[PDB]
Amino acid sequence: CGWHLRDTTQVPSTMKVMILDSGDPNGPLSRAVRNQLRLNGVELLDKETTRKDVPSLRLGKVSIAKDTASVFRNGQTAEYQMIMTVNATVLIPGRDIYPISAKVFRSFFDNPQMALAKDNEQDMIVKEMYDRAAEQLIRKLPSIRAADIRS
Amino acid sequence: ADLASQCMLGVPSYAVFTGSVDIMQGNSRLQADEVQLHQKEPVRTVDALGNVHYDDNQVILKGPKGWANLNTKDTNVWEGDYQMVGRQGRGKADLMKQRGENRYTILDNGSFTSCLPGSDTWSVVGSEIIHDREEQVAEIWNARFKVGPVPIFYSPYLQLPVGDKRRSGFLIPNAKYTTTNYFEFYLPYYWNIAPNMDATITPHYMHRRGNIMWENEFRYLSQAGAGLMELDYLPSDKVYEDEHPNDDSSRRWLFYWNHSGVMDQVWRFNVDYTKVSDPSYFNDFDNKYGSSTDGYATQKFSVGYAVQNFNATVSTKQFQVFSEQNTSSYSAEPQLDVNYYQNDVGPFDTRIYGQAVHFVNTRDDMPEATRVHLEPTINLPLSNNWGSINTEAKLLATHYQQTNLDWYNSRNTTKLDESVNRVMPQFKVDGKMVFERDMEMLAPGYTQTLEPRAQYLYVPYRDQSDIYNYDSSLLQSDYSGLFRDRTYGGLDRIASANQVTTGVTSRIYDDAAVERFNISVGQIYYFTESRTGDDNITWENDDKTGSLVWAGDTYWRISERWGLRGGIQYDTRLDNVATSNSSIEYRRDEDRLVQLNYRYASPEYIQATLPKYYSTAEQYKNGISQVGAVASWPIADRWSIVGAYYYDTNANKQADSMLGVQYSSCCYAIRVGYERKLNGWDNDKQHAVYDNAIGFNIELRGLSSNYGLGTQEMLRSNILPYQNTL
Amino acid sequence: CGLKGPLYFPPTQTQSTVPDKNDRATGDGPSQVNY
Ligand SMILES: *C[C@@H](COC(=O)CCCCCCCCCCCCCCC)OC(=O)CCCCCCCCCCCCCCC
Incomplete structure (x- = not known):
């Protein structure tokens, strides 16, 4: 009833070739974004390239925070909530600079009797949050292309 | 307007003559009445008399009598009052002197307040105030700090740091x-x-x-x-x-x-x-x-090396558990993780993960172990515009060396071994589609998407009851975690899997291709029971196969200031909703926000996943049912109230409450805070213990660029701190 | 009398993996209070 398979691509046709730029090129978010763009068939160029007509994706400040979300009746922590916030910009070669952002929420229960096990669980959670934040940024690329046509 | 620019408009911004004089030399003026100019050897001197007004870009000096030297740049204004230009600060001295190429502004029996004109909240009268511009300091001798007309204390040498340079x-x-x-x-x-x-x-x-x-x-x-x-x-x-x-x-x-x-x-x-x-x-x-x-103190060190397609890490993890009911705690001393990635091996992507860890316990009776893990992986990704399918295969090979098993093996029916090998493959298939439709009955230009997802996972069964559980904990199953390929963290318990996950997400985009709404539902269907060989979870139902896990998520960005979030988990082996949470926020800016939230965790979820004494202890056994409110709003552009209240609906008693008020003027700031919190448990009377705290802070303003209203410091100062969910 | 402020080297960011547990948001700026 009106539905049809997605005829257009995920990443805009303009951003088929991009420059991925970062201050921590070997970090966990750069690896997540670079792999996500590779799935979408995007050809990534080096920052120091001869090309002067390709958009540049810049990865900025990444914050991870773990806070107490609820407590037991003795005041001890019951649940921890983790928030990951990512800031980025997409520079079109000739137009302005378009900022984008991501925010991921996760939570889990705390167990002082298996604190080592809960440490490994938290490390696993952060890796997943990096995959989600990489997807959220890529879903914002069509919004940048639309703003480009308006201006 | 903000405080910083509201306090700015208040401040100023850039041969006898015998007549109304307006002599200007580049920048410096002198609106004196009678000026006496001398050039005695040259030693050029200027003797001003009558309503001297030494206007400038840095100070405004007013005095009945003046004097200057045109060679050494030494001035003298008698019985005057000064005022900084382009910055905040003013006063009144019996003699103002500028010395050393206009570096020192020396005041004899002078005062200094950074309050705006017509306001005299505080002042600091000395006898030899000196403003030094190289050091950005104001040295005061025989200082007396005054509030209003009443002094509050006296002390010699009461330096005031002017500017933003650290001292x-x-x-x-x-x-x-x-x-x-x-x-x-x-x-x-x-x-x-x-x-x-x-x-x-x-x-x-x-x-x-x-x-x-x-x-x-x-x-x-x-x-x-x-x-x-x-x-x-x-x-x-x-x-x-x-x-x-x-x-x-x-x-x-x-x-x-x-x-x-x-x-x-x-x-x-x-x-x-x-x-x-x-x-x-x-x-x-x-x-x-x-x-x-x-609940404990974390003590971790880590050194790592990372490149484009390889990374290695050495780390130690130790914990200090506080409760007296816990005396055994395992540690990784040390742990080594190595990853190597290689793509485009034909149409495949390859990957290796290895580890080596040593486990030690605080107790001297517990087992001790060394473990080595290897995990090669290969996958074949396929994709187009409207769908993608990803097939993956993996090998999980582990080795153990367990020592110090005499004390454990004596009092347990099933025994731990000294040498264990565990090899098991894993096969996974993951699919995805996307549909779209033009949703014009909502608003012109909008679209809606429908994204169904499916996954199949198979892992064989290995009996792992001869391996002690060092670093495996049960993982939560929210909607994001429905498609996870693991049931535990760590590598000590690897459950079998013969299951299919199905889910669907719907999004609503507007004419700017900006996402407005998304909602997700999913389930996991088990064809055989998931066993690690050591299965002792306390389920309310004896269900093993079928549709057992359900989950959902939502997020609605109602406006630029409104936001709604939600999430629910249901488990059929609990016969009840496992966990749930909700949240709605209105946030105009940093200083205006209201938030409501709710968190739920069933009594059966506490019994299933947490220690066995939680389900019988009064402070643990009822789960979570918590309603919270957070607010922040200014009154009359200077006051700022912050409040928080968290309530436990099961016990009908609060968990936390906070209230803070700050008044931030142009030359001072005062903050008062209060918080009542849960702070322990009385085991004799079986009731909780609360703590009350009142804090008082005061501050000087107008000397540096700091003009904060203190909102974010107040919002983050309680046991359940504020998180921005907009 | 002293002023406390941000650090700098004597004359974007790193993507971490360890979260900040219960950060109290005590801003780093020129101040005469401890924070
Ligand atoms: C170097 C100073 C840093 O502070 C300054 O920059 C100098 C100004 C001092 C700021 C005082 C602000 C607090 C008092 C305001 C009035 C109370 C509140 C009013 C109602 C809400 O070092 C300092 O830290 C400041 C000094 C320490 C605090 C002073 C408290 C009183 C001292 C009395 C001892 C003096 C005894 C001898 C004279 C009787």
Whole structure:
């Protein structure tokens, strides 16, 4: 009833070739974004390239925070909530600079009797949050292309 | 308008003559009446008389009599009043002098207030105030600090730091009243070691403990990253002695160290270390580096090397558990993780993950182990515009060496082995589609998407009851975690899998291709029971196969200021909703927000996943049912109220409440805070224990660029701090 | 009398993996209070 398979691509046709730029090129978010763009068939160029007509994706400040979300009746922590916030910009070669952002929420229960096990669980959670934040940024690329046509 | 620019418009902005004089030399003016000019050898002198007005770009000087020297640039204004131009500050002295190429502004029996004209909230009268522009300091002799017309204290040499350059000296103290320590007073001294390091020493005096606690902070900035150390030491405690008379020494202390940095883009260094003298340290003493809500102290070091397609890490993980019901705690000393990635091996992507860890326990009766893991992986990704399918295969090969098993094997029916091998493959298939439709009955230009997803996972069954569980904990199943390929963390319990996950997400985009709404539902269907060989979870139902796990998520961005979030988990083996949470926020800016939230965790979920004494202990057994409210709003553009209230609907008692008020003028700021929190459990009367705290802070303004309203510091200062969910 | 402020080297960011547990949001700026 009106539905049809997605005829257009995920990443805009303009951003088929991009420059991925970062201050921590070997970090966990750069690896997540670079792999996500590779799935979408995007050809990534080096920052120091001869090309002067390709958009540049810049990865900025990444914050991870773990806070107490609820407590037991003795005041001890019951649940921890983790928030990951990512800031980025997409520079079109000739137009302005378009900022984008991501925010991921996760939570889990705390167990002082298996604190080592809960440490490994938290490390696993952060890796997943990096995959989600990489997807959220890529879903914002069509919004940048639309703003480009308006201006 | 904001405070910073509201306090700006208040401040100013850029041969006898015998007549109305307006002599100007580039920038400096002199609107005197009678000017007497001399050129005696040349030693050029200017003798002004009558309503002298030395206007400038830096100061405005007014005085009945003036004088100047055109060679050494020495001025003299008698019985005058000055005022800074382009900055905040004004006063009145019996003699104003500019000396040393207009470096020193020396005042004899002068005063100085950074308050706006017509306001005299505070002043500091001295006798030899000197403003030095190279050092950005204002030295005062025989200083008397005055509030209104009433002095409050006297002391020689009351330097006032002008500007934003850092200096070493005493900071303004602050006070508290808590029910644990009674009246408290902090007197900080700041030491400015170097541009990239500094230290701070704070004698914290607590009335009830009857001694001074010494707080020492050290911040540094290096090539390897930025860090912070904290070392607190209370030589003796009077409250602690009564509760623990048998202990010979009642010292309390805390060591904290946090480091994080990346050097040369390839070396990553991390430290997260906490150590305290006793379990009850944070229930008594309020720190920025620990909370009374903690259950243990984490002590981790990590050194790693990362490149484009390879990374290795060596780390140690140790924990200090506080509760007296726990005495055994495992540690990784050390752990080595290695990853290697290689793509485009034909149409496949390959990957290797290896590990080597050594487990040690605080107790001397517990098993001790060494484990080596290898995990090669290969996948074949396929995709197009409207769909993608990803097929993956994996091998999980582990080896164990378990020693010190005599004490455990004596009192348990099933025995641990000394040498264990565990090899098991894993096969997974993951699919995805996307549909779209033009949703015009909502608004023109909108679209809606429908994204169904499916996954199939198969792992065979290995009996893992001869392996002790060191680092495996049950993982939550939210909607994001429905498609996870693991049931436990770590590598000690690897459950079997023969299951299909199905889910669907719908999104609503507007004409700007900006997402407005998304909602998700999913389930996991089991064809065979998931067993690790050591299965002792306490399920309410004897269900093994079928559709057992359900989950959902939502997010609606109603406007630029409104937001709604939700999530629910249902488990059929619990016969009830496992967990749930909800949240709605309105947020105009940092100083205007309202938030409502709810958190739920069933009594059966506590029984299934947490320790066995949780389901019988009164402070644990009922799960979670918590309603919270957070607000922040200004009144009359200077006041700022922050409040928080968290309520437990199961016990009909609060968990936390907070209230803070701050008044921030153009030359001072005052903040008062209150918080009542849960702070322990009384085992005799079987009721919770609360703590009350009132804090009073004061501050001077107008000397540096600081004009904060203190909202974010107040919103983050309780046990359940504020998180921005918009 | 002293002023406390941010550190700098004597004359974007790193993507971490360790979260900040219960950060108290004590801003780093020129101040005469401890924070
Ligand atoms: C170097 C100073 C840092 O502070 C300054 O910059 C100098 C100005 C001092 C700021 C005082 C603000 C607090 C007092 C305001 C009035 C109370 C509140 C009013 C109602 C809400 O070092 C400091 O840290 C400041 C000095 C320490 C605090 C002073 C408290 C009183 C001292 C009395 C001892 C004097 C005894 C001899 C004279 C009787």
